[PDB]
């Protein structure tokens, strides 16, 4: 089954275009790479709870 | 007889181009007449109105700043029992061997995972990390354990 | 008592005067207008 | 030379079958049309229009209360009022009536059922003027109107009809060429006695079954539809004549189609059979149908439903016996 | 024109979005239904219900009668199986008896009743 | 302006018809180069090898035409003589060839050194030896694959694309 | 459009912001842009020369353009972004399971995760020159993985209802005061999408040579 | 979960399940066939 | 003078294959049964080279109409025989702007697969439901409902852009072919739509090598319905010779 | 391992067991009933503050009309949609190295997506499944079987690594002349 | 359970092949008749195509009713029918067990369904009658048209069996509906038949020339029927060519009247001196008209010609 499948795949044109969904993974970090803008360190009016 | 009892009840024609608002207030024609009506509605809403914050956007930097430039080095500190436990937990992973379960591109992973949790690798860590990935054949990842030690 | 109450009934306003108009249809808006809200 | 434009189509009658017709061609136009919609009533062209505007169209609409503007504006009129009467009102007898008024090239429908000779005056005229009548009967009803399933039998220039076929389409599946100038009329006059006729039979049927003690109608439906006579007239109507059987009191509901629209139907076949000086009596059948929806007309029940032929075919008996 | 406005298309100015065309289509577009016929096993579908008639809570066997023929059976859908008035549990033992069928696997389970 | 739809009228002809109008004026051109060149290839392909006599002896026997209906030898319906396998069947090895390096360029995403790309073209030579041979080193063969380059950049004065371009005609001519 | 009964008001200010005589910087990038802006754009100005065919003029002009001019708040040359499409992994099941996929809807997928869903990055995170776009797909009811329309992408994020009808880009000024001046990774990234072939074949790479013809 | 084909061994004990859970040496053939449908 | 019923021909289209279907079935039982072709969409017009290729062989098609089988669904029980005629579900293509896709072959260029491991659909087998067999369900959810107006009415396809929505089409299914004497598919590729770059000669061979089949299929569907009902239905017989 | 059993939602090998990707619903009426693709353990938690483990993603059940037709207007786009928002990167992390379990109804939601292959449950009703012979495989394996270091390569690109880098990078990223 | 089939007439012999067929060995099949070596014949030909079940050959109704638990009567004529269930010595239902169970499918009056229910009710035995209508070649196939009438759980266990070689069986009620359905059946037969007489003479009439397109909207509009969709086609030919002699059809004018001669015996009085029937009677009438001319085995569209004879009767009458 997979031999044949591969060499139809191969064979054919259009499934040979990239796929960016299963190609590869994008920052697999636990973090952003860039500042969203948050968090914020600041409380609001409506809160007490300030630390 | 429903759709004859169901009339429009609901819609009205809709703005002409150059309509005045429901208080009298227009752009472009009426200027300083125009009053701001943002302090008669209720000051606080229970949910977002479909006028909140429709149209808002942020500075140019948020969209043009570079890939971890916002990071502030921050030195986080712990005892060291957890240095000692972490530095034997990372030497262990580096040094799991290869071919069953793990690959060995998983030693350098686990290098550069110390970096990341803002841990100083030892030349210990080094030094397994290169002998690892030396007896599994991966010469060119040996070197990157050297390339990675010199950037730090 | 609507919350744009205020704004609507404004003195000068073109509300109030359309609301001066049709309570007296023949006002002079100048002068037979009126600027309390007492009625 | 000309300039490229939406071509004018309007709509005139608007009464329970005419105000669909413009709802789909307003639904389904896509912004190619530019829909007229004409009404006695400027009020009810108004609510029309209204009413289809914020259930939400894809094309633009005009308002018209007399006949020379939708003569004026209209390239192609579909014409679906309630009498024969009001279809000779508005197409020949008023001052400003449309065929009497038609321009160069345009084109003019009737789905109203007129008479053959009528329909024969309207083309005739139509021809004179130099434009096109198609007499295009209908058959359906409001609700296949809005599914957009009506039968039309067109009688006219082939031309003409491949021209509007995308038209049809709009609120008629089932759309058939019979021929040219009057075969429509002619086609939809056959289907009309058939169904009078149909229906006499399955009020019949439904009353012997009640006759013999049985009372489980909707058994009795499979059972016909599965076997080698079933009609859609006795689908149609069996439930409501088990229902006014079983409680012969109970007085038939109202429809759209009635009896008196039976009546003035087959009247035009009264007038349009041939064989006056043998006294045209050839068909058995059709008089006894004919007959029965007679009395239940005189009966007060000429607007109610076509089941009411149970409670009026002994009344049209008693006719017989008075002749 | 009816609207107040000589100037504008539609008087009430409806969202671009309400008249945007829907287009559809039919999961018969995609794959078709065949229909398995009776074996030797199963010949009919009342052997075919009192087959897949295994469990007490599931009296599969009790509406042989409810069915015409086996492509009447095999072409009811669970709506129409409902509405013929066959409890919750039975409908879905004989929709997934039938539903294994149509996947090769006939009814042959042992009834765990006694 | 719009006419009823008597038929079931396609509302898009092609996938691209209305992504080509989301493209740039420059872009526009710089995706033109390689459209044009696949689709006048496709268009030759089916009469790659017939001299010029034999496609007006073509072009004389389909004779049939209606108001457009099409010209015979754009896409000629002539059954052609060498029977071949995969894209060849399409395509003339040139731009099986030409095709790779638009691959390779895709996904490199600008400029990038020959290597990337010279044993792909190895691999389609070694595939097919008898084109190999047949169009291997000529002028024809180089410069049409080679008319890519320039949509990588199209703006760089000549002197860049020569020397960028240097590297690939050595490899194509060695 | 309106409704009876709600006396709708108008707004005045698109959005809450700084104003721009509070800054000699604010000011100049106001003069600077309005400079590089019209004043009253019409039909036939460079901005919409987009609409190089009459259809297109007809359909942008005549219905939806509310939408079309929705879009995008910027003025651009495109009022929109190319689609494309991927490639379906090998199914090793084959013809058994080549009938999946195919639905009677589009079905969307919009990517989420750290890195992704942040509205102060919108225009970098749906941008087709980032390494790391936000990788919307769409599989059709016929089976076709495609990428996500402009508008498909931007539906992902808050609502943003404004436009700008006079800054025009490409008239910018330059060469007076807009004189814009200048690890491994980036070569393991290039590693990462150079193709890879030659792992299956100093032993530099050539043409075959020709032994059928000798 | 494991499926009772009603023609396997039979356990005749009326104190506890009335069917073994053994199989015919075809339902051990055919069941490979599905072990490998799924393997694939 | 026959026992059948009637004969409906279902399609999604009913320009080119459902109407030369009709008319060789037409006339090879001489006008005397009944045979209605219909399809799911009506909005279309009979083929011109429908028309001509059927003129060729000697019947004329011109008379006859498009239209849906709409009313022939609320009598389907009716009916003795239930002809559907439909593409092959594996070169399908939902976009009519393409060419069919390739079949599946089984056992060098396309890939052929072993009959075991990929076997066919067997023949023997009967259809329950093809692309052919639906009917369109018109709605419509008006604003000027106070029910369908609420903020929180879920008959919308949307949410926070307007409310109700205008008139739509769905389709259902109708599972009942099976409820006919006689029910059969014939699998023939569509013809009505004209690929990208065909020319009109071929464009014309393509309805030419769909009327052989068509005729071959309808004798062998006249001869078997023959052997049902048991009275001569090939009453013309006149074409098949040549 | 109870000694009166949870009858109604019994498990395999106790608690709390392997994570997996399943499609939790919510407690509201099928009308506004929508889905999210979450990672739990096998027996879910209902005694912690932390119930699961990731949010892969939300899916809505209800097909929304295509608001977004005349943008670029392409190949029957104007089909309702089924939206949905998935995390690929999570996916994968918990999918592969920490080989989590997959349930059938979010295998086949993904399959849709291009990030897995149809699921083991859908299948045709057309195709009976395949009748496989030791000697027929043999001969296709023998007939057209791979070579020993292609088959090794392959699996090692498709596994161990995917950065190899060529000769001419080996060269370029050797040191210089200088030499420090 | 034991099935045994004892009618076999010309549409019996199908009933029994199919239940010898599809009984796979599952029920035990009895075949009866009144001469010995025309059973024998059958069983013959029934074993040497197919025998799952052991079959046995009775001359007499009573061996036939104290072996079986069903027996289904497949007869010609309503005195055959009665003479097998009620007027014999050994009458079935006379001699009926407590808990066998008997289904007729010949087309008896009401009434007579009336006692053949009474006797057995009075004798615990569940009596309930199935009238069929269809071709033999239907039979053979195994479509038919079963209108059962009696108990309802007596139905219920009859379904199986029905099925062997009918395809649309259905319950009309208790105390033999099924006459009645059978009967109002052919009623309304004839009334279509004669409206699309009517039809199509009145579309000759005014001139309207493809029949072919007519045919198609009337199907499609509203009063159409299988009938119409039937004759049509030959009516066409038949109204523009009177001349020719309406070809034979095994349903016939005279099959019609057969089984509409039931009707007035089911209907409770004539003496009102009026028809609460207009349609119905004028039906017959033209139907009687067209038999009482020679043409009584002729096919069911030759009401045509003779629709003109059946006003002679309603104008004399």
């Known amino acids: 089954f997979r031999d044949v499948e591969e060499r139809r795949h191969s064979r054919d044109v259009v499934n040979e275009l990239p796929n960016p969904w299963y190609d590869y993974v994008a920052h697999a970090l636990p973090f952003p790479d860039r500042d969203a803008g948050y968090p914020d360190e600041y409380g609001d009016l409506g809160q007490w709870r300030a630390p | 007889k429903v759709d004859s009892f169901h009339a429009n009840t609901q819609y009205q024609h809709a703005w002409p181009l150059l309509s005045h608002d429901d208080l009298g207030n227009s752009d472009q024609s009426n200027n300083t007449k125009n009053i701001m009506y943002s302090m008669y509605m209720p000051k606080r809403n229970k949910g977002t109105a479909p006028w909140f914050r429709g149209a808002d956007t ?95 | 008592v609507p919350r744009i109450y205020y704004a609507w009934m404004r003195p000068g306003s073109f509300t109030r005067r359309r609301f001066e108009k049709m309570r007296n249809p023949f006002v002079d808006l100048e002068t037979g207008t009126s600027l309390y809200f007492r009625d | 030379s000309a300039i490229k434009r939406s071509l004018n189509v309007g709509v005139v009658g608007m009464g329970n079958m005419g ?305 | 024109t009816y609207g107040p406005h000589k100037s504008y298309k539609y008087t009430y100015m409806p969202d671009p979005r309400k008249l945007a065309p829907i287009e559809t289509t039919q999961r018969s577009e995609i794959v078709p239904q065949s229909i398995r016929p009776p074996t030797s096993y199963v010949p009919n579908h009342e052997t075919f219900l009192e087959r897949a008639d295994i469990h007490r809570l599931r009296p599969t066997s009790d509406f042989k009668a409810s069915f015409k023929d086996w492509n009447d059976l095999f072409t009811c859908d669970k709506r129409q199986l409902r509405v013929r008035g066959i409890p919750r549990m039975t409908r879905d033992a004989i929709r997934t008896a039938v539903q294994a069928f149509q996947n090769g696997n006939p009814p042959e389970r042992f009834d765990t009743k006694e | 302006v719009a006419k009823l739809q008597h038929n079931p009228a396609p509302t898009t002809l092609n996938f691209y018809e209305k992504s080509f109008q989301q493209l740039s004026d420059v872009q526009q051109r710089q995706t033109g180069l390689l459209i044009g060149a696949a689709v006048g290839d496709a268009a030759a392909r089916a009469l790659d090898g017939y001299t010029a006599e034999e496609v007006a002896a073509v072009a004389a026997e389909s004779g049939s035409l209606q108001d457009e209906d099409e010209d015979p030898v754009v896409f000629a319906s002539v059954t052609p003589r060498e029977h071949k396998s995969g894209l060849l069947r399409h395509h003339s090895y040139t731009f099986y060839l030409f095709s790779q390096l638009l691959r390779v360029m895709a996904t490199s995403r600008g400029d990038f050194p020959v290597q990337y790309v010279k044993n792909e073209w190895v691999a389609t030579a070694r595939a097919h030896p008898d084109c190999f041979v047949r169009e291997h080193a000529s002028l024809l063969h180089v410069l049409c694959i080679t008319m890519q380059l320039p949509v990588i950049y199209p703006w760089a004065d000549d002197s860049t694309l020569r020397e960028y371009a240097s590297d690939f005609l050595e490899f194509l001519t060695e | 459009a309106r409704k009876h009964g709600l006396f709708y008001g108008k707004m005045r200010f698109a959005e809450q912001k700084i104003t721009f005589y509070s800054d000699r910087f604010l000011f100049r990038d106001l003069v600077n842009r309005r400079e590089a802006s019209y004043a009253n754009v019409w039909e036939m100005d460079d901005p919409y020369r987009f609409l190089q065919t009459e259809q297109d003029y007809e359909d942008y002009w005549g219905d939806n353009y509310d939408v079309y001019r929705r879009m995008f708040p910027e003025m651009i040359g495109r009022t929109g972004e190319p689609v494309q499409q991927y490639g379906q992994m090998p199914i090793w099941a084959g013809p058994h399971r080549q009938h999946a996929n195919k639905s009677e809807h589009n079905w969307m997928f919009a990517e989420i995760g750290v890195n992704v869903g942040h509205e102060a990055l919108k225009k970098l995170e749906l941008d087709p020159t980032n390494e790391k776009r936000r990788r919307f797909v769409i599989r059709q009811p016929d089976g076709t993985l495609r990428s996500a329309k402009m508008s498909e992408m931007r539906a992902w994020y808050w609502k943003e209802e404004w436009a700008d009808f006079r800054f025009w880009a490409p008239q910018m000024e330059w060469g007076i005061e807009n004189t814009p001046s200048q690890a491994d990774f980036r070569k393991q990234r290039r590693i990462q999408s150079r193709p890879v072939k030659w792992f299956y074949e100093e032993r530099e790479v050539r043409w075959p040579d020709v032994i059928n013809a000798a | 979960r494991q499926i009772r084909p009603y023609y396997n061994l039979p356990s005749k004990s009326e104190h506890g399940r009335k069917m073994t859970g053994f199989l015919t040496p075809y339902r051990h053939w055919m069941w490979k066939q599905n072990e490998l449908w799924r393997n694939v | 003078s026959t026992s059948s019923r009637g004969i409906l021909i279902a399609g999604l289209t009913n320009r080119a294959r459902t109407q030369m279907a009709e008319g060789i079935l037409r006339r090879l039982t001489a006008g005397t049964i009944f045979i209605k072709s219909g399809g799911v969409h009506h909005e279309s017009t009979i083929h011109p ?70 076997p066919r659909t067997p023949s023997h087998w009967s259809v329950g439901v093809d692309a052919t067999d639906v009917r369109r369900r018109w709605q419509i959810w008006s604003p000027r409902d106070p029910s369908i107006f609420h903020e929180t009415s879920t008959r919308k396809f949307q949410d926070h852009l307007y409310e109700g929505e205008p008139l739509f089409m769905q389709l259902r299914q109708c599972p009942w072919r099976t409820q006919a004497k006689v029910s059969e598919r014939w699998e023939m590729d569509e013809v009505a739509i004209r690929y990208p770059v065909e020319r009109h000669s071929a464009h014309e061979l393509r309805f030419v090598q769909a009327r052989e089949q068509l005729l071959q299929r309808s004798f062998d569907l006249l001869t078997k319905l023959e052997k049902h009902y048991g009275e001569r239905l090939l009453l013309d017989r006149a074409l098949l010779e040549e | 391992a109870r000694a009166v059993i949870k009858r109604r939602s019994p498990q395999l090998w106790g608690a709390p067991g392997a994570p997996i990707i399943r499609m939790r619903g919510h407690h509201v009426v099928w009308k506004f009933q929508s889905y999210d693709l979450v990672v739990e353990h096998t027996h879910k938690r209902r005694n912690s503050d932390i119930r699961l483990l990731h949010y892969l993603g939300k899916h809505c059940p209800h097909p929304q009309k295509s608001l977004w037709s005349p943008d670029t207007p392409v190949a029957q786009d104007r089909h309702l949609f089924m939206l949905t928002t998935v995390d690929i990167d999570a996916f994968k992390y918990w999918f592969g190295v920490k080989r989590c379990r997959l349930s059938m109804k979010p295998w086949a939601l993904l399959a849709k997506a291009g990030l897995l292959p149809p699921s083991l449950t859908q299948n045709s009703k057309i195709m009976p499944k395949p009748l496989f012979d030791k000697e027929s495989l043999m001969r296709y394996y023998l007939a057209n079987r791979k070579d020993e270091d292609v088959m090794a390569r392959e699996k090692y690109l498709n596994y161990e690594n995917s950065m190899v880098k060529t000769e001419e990078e080996r060269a370029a990223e050797r040191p210089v002349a200088p030499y420090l």
């Not at chain 4, 009795?220 to 009609?231: F, I, K, T």
């Not at chain 9, 025989?81 to 594996?90: G, K, L, M, P, T």
């Open chain 4, 19 to 323: 105000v669909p017709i413009a709802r789909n061609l307003g639904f389904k136009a896509r912004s190619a049309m530019y829909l007229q919609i004409h009404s006695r009533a400027l009020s009810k062209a108004k609510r029309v229009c209204d009413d289809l505007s914020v259930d939400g169209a894809t094309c633009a609409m005009r308002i018209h209360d007399r006949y020379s503007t939708m003569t004026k504006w209209c390239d192609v009129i579909v014409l679906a009022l309630a009498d024969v009467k009001a279809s000779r009102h508005a197409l020949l007898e008023d001052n400003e009536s449309l065929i009497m008024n038609a321009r160069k090239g345009q084109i003019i429908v009737d789905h109203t059922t007129v008479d053959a000779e009528t329909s024969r005056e309207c083309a005739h005229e139509a021809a004179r003027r130099g434009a096109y009548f198609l007499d295009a009967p209908m058959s359906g009803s409001p609700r296949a109107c809005f599914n957009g399933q009506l039968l039309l039998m067109v009688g006219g220039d082939a031309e003409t009809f491949q021209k509007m076929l995308p038209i049809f389409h709009m609120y008629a599946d089932n759309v058939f060429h019979m021929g040219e100038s009057g075969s429509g009329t002619a086609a939809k006059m056959i289907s009309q006695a058939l169904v009078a006729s149909h229906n006499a039979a399955a009020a019949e049927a439904l009353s012997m079954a009640h006759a013999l003690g049985i009372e489980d109608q909707s058994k009795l439906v499979q059972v016909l539809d599965a076997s080698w006579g079933s009609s859609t007239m006795l689908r149609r109507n069996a439930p409501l004549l088990q229902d006014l059987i079983r409680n012969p009191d109970k007085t038939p509901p109202t429809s759209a189609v009635s009896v008196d629209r039976l009546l003035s139907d087959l009247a035009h076949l009264d007038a349009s059979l041939p064989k006056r000086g043998g006294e045209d009596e050839p068909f058995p059948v059709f008089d006894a149908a004919l007959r029965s929806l007679a009395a239940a007309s005189d009966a007060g029940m000429g607007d109610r439903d076509l089941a009411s032929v149970v409670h009026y075919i002994e009344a049209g008996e008693a006719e017989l016996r008075n002749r």
């Open chain 2, 58 to 152: 942020y500075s140019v930097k948020y969209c043009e700043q570079g890939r971890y430039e916002y990071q502030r080095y921050l030195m986080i500190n712990r005892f060291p029992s957890e240095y000692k436990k972490h530095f034997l937990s990372f030497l262990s992973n580096i040094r799991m061997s290869s071919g069953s379960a793990t690959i060995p591109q998983e030693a350098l992973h686990w290098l550069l995972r110390m970096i990341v949790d803002n841990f100083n690798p030892q030349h210990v860590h080094y030094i397994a990390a290169m002998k690892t990935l030396q007896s599994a054949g991966e010469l060119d990842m040996a070197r990157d354990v050297w390339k990675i030690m010199e950037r730090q």
């Open chain 9, 49 to 118: 080279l429908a028309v001509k290729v059927m003129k060729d062989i000697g019947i004329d098609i011109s008379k006859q109409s498009v239209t849906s089988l709409e009313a022939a669904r609320r009598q389907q029980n009716t009916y003795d025989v239930y002809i559907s005629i439909d593409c092959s579900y594996e070169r399908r293509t939902l976009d009519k702007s393409q060419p069919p896709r390739a079949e599946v072959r089984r056992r060098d260029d396309p890939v052929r697969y072993d009959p075991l491991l990929v």
